[model samples]
Target chain A: MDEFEMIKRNTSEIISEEELREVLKKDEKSAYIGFEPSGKIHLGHYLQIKKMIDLQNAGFDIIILLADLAAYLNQKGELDEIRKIGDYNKKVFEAMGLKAKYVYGSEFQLDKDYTLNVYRLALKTTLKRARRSMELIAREDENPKVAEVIYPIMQVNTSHYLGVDVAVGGMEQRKIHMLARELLPKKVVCIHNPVLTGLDGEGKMSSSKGNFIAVDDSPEEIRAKIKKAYCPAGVVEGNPIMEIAKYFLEYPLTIKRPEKFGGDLTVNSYEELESLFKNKELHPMYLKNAVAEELIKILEPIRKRLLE
Target chain B: MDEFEMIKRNTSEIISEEELREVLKKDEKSAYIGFEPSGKIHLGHYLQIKKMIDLQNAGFDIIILLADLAAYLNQKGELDEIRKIGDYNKKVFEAMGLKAKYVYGSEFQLDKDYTLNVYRLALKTTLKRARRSMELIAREDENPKVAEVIYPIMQVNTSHYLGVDVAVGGMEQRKIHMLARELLPKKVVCIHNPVLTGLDGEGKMSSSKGNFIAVDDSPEEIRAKIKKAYCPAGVVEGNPIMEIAKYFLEYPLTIKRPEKFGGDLTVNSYEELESLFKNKELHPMYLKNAVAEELIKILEPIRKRLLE
Candidate 1:
């Protein structure tokens, strides 16, 4: 697994290399990403922070918005101590070597006059649209609270008030981002990334499931998590390790296999890997090992930096 | 038609002399009243402003809260030119000889941060309670907007935010005032005045129906409107004249009619007049004429001030 192959397999067709280059080429302007501080930052956040780091190095300003209020109300105080949780998560981002220019809390703006405008916008949106946005956000939660139901508008309003040019979030956030584009002043752009699956071969990666390996995880922990993940050949559905390889290794990396080992293996693109995987020519064990090695190398520095 | 008869007929049952004395006794302290600026301040506002002035003379600090934002959103922008409308309404109150404090427009708190706590309190109220309050307010309109539906919460929040000790409004606003009592930290007192009926004796008094005599109306205009009022058998159910006598006339003036006026007109006390009215002995014509004269006298000074 190499860089070109990883890029080809994991990234969406909707997001082309040219478009990515165009976005990265924009003046070193700030872009925002947000997360509800429900618990400790996990593997999903690690991937996002790393991506943000890449964008930062490419001359983009990064902002990490802390949705502390949303998190508080979403869990019905299940995860209390919002400020402490947010501070801890902020440390997680800083530890990942991500250059975040700002870390804002929604609670601080809860009193701002801008909230009146946000309320006005919320009224303009229909219940159906709001419900859909809520559903997208609550997809990962086993029990969504009433506050979660009201979170999308708050998120949209945050972006609207801050005057951000572009917003980045997971695929599930696509609905809200699109709604924001419609509700906001039309000057903003939305860039959504696909969701990353957990090591359990289930739905989206989450800390609660204990299936995600955090960026701060030790090298041994990362390898052990990958080893325990459910990955099997010809098991197209719910194969976490295979999905990881397709997303992180086979798609993002361009690999060259020697003729004697895998006979002139020069996988250049995601389509080639997909074809091979579909044809059952790609062994799940080999793919998992390759993905595990790549992940370890990528996260080595982040873990070391966090320890410092 | 005498003052004794008026109080006996309408207010004797609702309020006691002790309560009235208490209200008047605290008149020197600042009292706050709120009005939704949905449209031009009409006859109802003039009457309320007059009441404020009466309270002020009794030594109360009067605070008039002009709910401009609530009105704008609740009416769904049906009435344009908000500032002009609010100004005209403020002038109306000022013309009524009201020396109380004047606060208008959401911009009044533009640079302030007092609204956050109010929103927090609003969130504590359930949708069911909010809906009930909305329905109570919606009695004035056929098809209410969502803003109208949420108006009560905003109204209650206003009182809580201002830290008003006493809130005065029409009976229609009782639910919201009650909500304020439930939501606010302090125990706030609420005084609800009965609705004023129109000269036509149909529904509440409204300028749109052209059945109201404004504080600025000439004596002749007041007389003409009173003459055309629906005083069947000199009294109709929910009679406007009786309403005036009940709310405006003092106990001594209402309970003791002169012996020369009518047969057995020698009412000895408040209880006697109440018994007479309950027994249907008081003529409706006499009541209307008397009430008309009192209203004319009460509004004359206000009209003069406005003209000046």
Candidate 2:
């Protein structure tokens, strides 16, 4: 699928296509996407980093915001966890052949002055809105820790203070990005992609879960993982491998599949792919095997580059 | 007036005599009175410092908290204003012969680990109570400033984090202190004293209004200022000098007056002095002159010390 079509289908629920086009049409400007250093960057991260790379290739300046502080707080101040995740995330971007300006939140000394500015912007938003946005991002076990509760407000204020025009994140971050668009001093545009679920197909993709396949996974490991994945037919939502194929592989490998394996299919849009899957014309096993092969093919060169 | 009788009359609307006795019954413990060095420490500050001194003599361990950051913000980044007020406040304590420990708020560096603990404690408080307390002590101009709005919460949180048993300030600060008592984990105590009015007898006493007499004032300056002050018909209310007399002057001098000047010949207690003034027996001029003399006597040593 084309870049415009990807944005249209993925973010249509949160933002209008007309608005997205208007934001994208502006003169090449800088934008940032942050990833908290929690663990190794897996295939799930590529889903978003690819978008960043596309924007950068389109001449927009990109910034990689390393959420070191958020990661520290999330991990309850475990330095080893931060180090491990930090090292892997850096390798992920390098492996993708993407270079962007980087900044770490933990390195910035945001005391009374920074917090005061945050409070100023927070005043522009109502408690009801803040509470709603918080609830949307909260996980089942996540009880909205004070830092997490304030995260959305801080993110919004950061965009306003830094004068950023676009913010990108996973679908779960939609509420916070929407708040930024509403509350930021300037018109900040937001783009949200669907959350990639773990290989287990139970919840959002998480590195802590062994279900994740790293971007640098060996071909043998990738094959083994895909072979064992629970992608039974008729289980669309809970089938991890099929979901990956439909979402990540469908767009990039539409012209590469063999005809007997339903390779001649034209998935011009996400809706077409969804319809094809729902109608059961696309076998779950075939889709999973094709997705695994394409994923290995896409990551092979990047893994070589990373090793170098 | 005697402390008990003074509480019974002037402050009957707020604190009761029984409450005062209860506070005094406990063995002298460490207590702190904080002042925001936002501007020159005016005559109102003298009353607070004097209270600290009195507490010290009453066997309490006294501390004077200098709100350097609040002062810096209040003065809008005027280093000269902060220095002038800080120096003047120090001189006032010295003049009053106070041995209380002095602490500057800026020294705490709330960015450090220890300070982060305090921030956590502050977050435990509900935003509503903090907002209400801020409204109580905020000036008309300060109402719109973010720092002013959040200062009361920070102050209250400081007491809890510092593990203080008693927090002291003027009547206007009572709301904030009370909020601290309600929210702090250790059940902090609050001691509220009345604030002296400005020398112009309009609104609360403030250095910004220039309605003040410095603690280092010369005897001649003290006498002249008192003689020209607005003390009508020997009554205390709205009379800056008389108010100072009732609150700061020691017993004999505060109550004594010339017998031939239609002054009541009452020697029982400070209570008798206040009654005589209220009943039109003691003239306002007599009270002002007597208060001025006692003030001069108290401040002379301070002036000498500053000169040294």
Candidate 3:
């Protein structure tokens, strides 16, 4: 695949395709994804990780920011505990063949210069504007804590500090990513990967919701999670099982089934699979089982590498 | 003066007079006042400074914070420029003979532990509560900047880091001081001094408004400012000149005038002066001139000392 094709695969949209084309022309380009480290490194994260691999394969250097301070501010845990999770996450990202540079929040966030940028950005943002940008992303309570506004400022500063040419995250980061482009001293190209559907058929797949398939999950857990994921026959819309197939399944994929259930199937692309599924040629049971088997196959090496 | 009298001298209210008296009984006690360093050190500031002198006399070590970071966040200037003003402020305060330690925002605000506490306090404070704490003190645009709420958190951290037993400021700071009392790990006795009215009869004398009389104002400017000050024919309520007399003038105050108006009047206490001045027995001319002469006398030494 070409660089643009690699970048476009399994992704939702680049903030501006023109900017991506222009940035791709440069010999020296870099991308970054920041995470508020958590214990559950799941498929929700893998979609973003896969995007980074796409960018890296296209000759862009990748930086995975293990945001321990963000985790602490996010109420995930104390900084020390968050850093421990961050270390674990680094191992997972590396195990997935990311081959990216890793940095932690404390490494730069505590620096005087980085902190000053956070304050400078804070001064530039109004409460109304800051709160507006966080409306979709944060769990804003009736009495919103100052940390809610602070997190976005810090996230914006992270891009400038890391010197990234492109920022990668799931669609949930759009508001904050857009804010960064608007406010940072140096703007970055934002690349948003598609958010995976939750197994419970709610919003996005989230580790907090236990609907996600963890990266280190045993094959049994992967099978069980995909088996229970929301999938309806002849309707591919927002189907978690179909989402896994779209992201993880190979094109011209072979689907094996029992002779009693119409033997086997092969699809050339996600578009083809979508059309076939919508035409009632696909069954939810077959899709769930196929996705379960494929996911277990893909994550088996990841779980093995993590254990090793 | 007695210890409690010294502590209460020329102040508006303490958070609790009982707390002050009990804390005063401690063998080791310290008090602090934070200022966003300014070029203007006017009589409005002197009221609070004089209270610090009172606290010093009562055996409390004083910390006068030259808040350059706060001033920078205020968009007053960059840190370097703000700290330059901080140096000038320090000279003026030292010239006023405040035998106390002066802390700049850069001194502790950049420290790791202090910055962490700033973040921790931000997590604890809600926007509504933080915004409420800054209501009267801060100049809120229709959409207040994030820095507006951040200032109170940093101020709260200042009291804890300074080991302040008593926090002193003008009545305008009551909300923020009260918040600090509520939020700081170590509660501070809040001592609120009365805010001096602006020479233009505006709400308070602040450097931002040209209505203020700077400490370094020449005797002629002092006289001109006082002569033009708002003093209604009989109304003492909300009168700037009367506020100056109440805070600065020595009672059994002598009011001198030309024989054509009303000769000279000698009165003791602000109440007597208020009654006489209210009844039209004391002319505005004599009151303005008397306050002017007294103010020039009071500030003349301050200007001279600062110059020296």
Candidate 4:
């Protein structure tokens, strides 16, 4: 795939595709994505990680920000957790076969100039507008703290300090990126990947909820987790199994079963598997098994590598 | 005067008289007051400046903050204006015999750790409480900007970073000082001096209004400005001339006059002057002349020093 095509594939939304085209034409293009270091590196993270991988393949230099300070700002954990959990997160991303420059929020966020820019942006942005940006992203509370507003301001400053041509994240980052583009000195191209549904078949996939598939899970763990995953036969919409099938399961694969159940069948593509499942020809249990095997094949080495 | 008496003298209100009593016993007491830079340093500033002088006389180290960054944050002026305006204010305060270690907000407010404390306090303070503090101090705009909220946060942080045992300001600063008392790591003694009425009698005395007697005003200008100042015979309340007489003019002051117009009078004390003014014995014109003469005496040396 061409550089533009590679970066755009499987993306849910691109903010102003024209801007992306402009960024792509630059001789030295850079992309940045920030993540608050969570303990478990789950599939939800992979959706964005893979997008960064694609950007890397497209010849764009990718910078992943381990947002430890942001986590502290959001009251996620203490300085201990910020340092240790942040380091662990970097290892997970690296083990996933992603090649990118890693940066800690504490590395540059505490600088005098960086702090000043945050204050200046705070001056430029209104409470009403800043509050509006955090509605979807900040953890909901009847009374939100001032940190909620401050985090978005810092995030915008990070974009400038990193000097990225494109900013990548899940759909949750849309408003903040939009706000950053308007407030930052330089314009940034924003690419948003879709959020994955949890293994419970509802709500956004999250490690805190324990409804995610961790990227470094053992093969047996992946198989055991998928056995209990929510999947209904002939149901393609909102089916966590089908979503997995489309993203990970290989096409033109054979489902070998004894003649007692169904004859051996070869699925030509994700579209074919999806149709077969929607028609009830592909049973929910059988589909889970297929996804488990495919995911195990993809994860075993990463899990083995992490141990090494 | 005793330390408590000196600290309490000429004050509108003390947040807690008990707190000041406790703070007075400390050996290493430091006091602080902050101001945004402006072209003219007028009587309004003098009220608070004098309080710092009183604290100094009582063995307190006074720290006056020239809030240049705050001026920038609040959009008071550009960087150039902040730097120059701040320098002019320091000179004026020093010339007024403040004996303070003048601090510029840019000196330490932008530091990494200092900014973090500000963010921490912002986390503790709620929007409703923060907005409430600004009602008496922030510039009134139909749609107030984020800077309005931000200015108070930095103000609170200033009190902490300055390490003041006593935080001093005009009555307008009561709420913000109160916030700092609640939020700072150490308990702070809050002393509130009354806000002087403008020479026009309509609003608070401010440099921008031009209805003020600047400390640097020539004797002629002082006399001229006082001549037009708002004063009423038989009324001491809200009377700018009497307020000035009570704060700055010496007691038992002599009002020299031509033999035709009640030749001469000697007011033994501020209370006596207030009583005479309230009973119409002190005419508004006569009172204005007396205040102008006394204020001119008080300000001439300060003006001369500024020129030097």
Best-matching candidate per lDDT: 3
Clashing pairs in 2: B1-B270, B1-B271, B234-B283, B234-B284
| TM per candidate | 0.74, 0.60, 0.94, 0.91
Pairs in steric clash, model 3: none
Give the per-residue lDDT of model 1 (tens digit) for B1-308. 53223222332122233444444545345567877653444556765665566556556678888767766655434224665676776777887667777787475433234444433543466545665776645534543333443456567667656666557676767777767777777656665566788777777776456766677778887777777787655244566665565555544444233466663344445455445555677766555555667677877777787677
lDDT per model, in order? 0.61, 0.65, 0.84, 0.83
Give the winner by DockQ: 1 or 2: 1
By DockQ rank, best first, the candidates go 3, 4, 1, 2
The DockQ score of candidate 4 comes to: 0.56
iRMS per model, in Å, is: 5.4, 6.5, 1.2, 1.6
Of the two candidates 3 and 4, the one with more favorable DockQ, higher being better, is: 3
Chain B TM per candidate, please?
A: 0.74, 0.79, 0.95, 0.96
Q: Largest TM-score belongs to which candidate?
A: 3
DockQ of each: 0.13, 0.09, 0.72, 0.56
User: Would you list the rank order by TM-score, best first?
Assistant: 3, 4, 1, 2
Clashes of 2: 4
Candidate 4 at A158: error in angstroms?
A: 1.4
Docking class of 3: medium
What are the runs in model 2 whose C-alpha is more than 4 Å off? A1-31, A35-48, A55-308, B1-29, B58-61, B73-75, B78-84, B139-145, B160-165, B182-185, B218-242, B254-268
Better of 3 and 4 by TM-score: 3
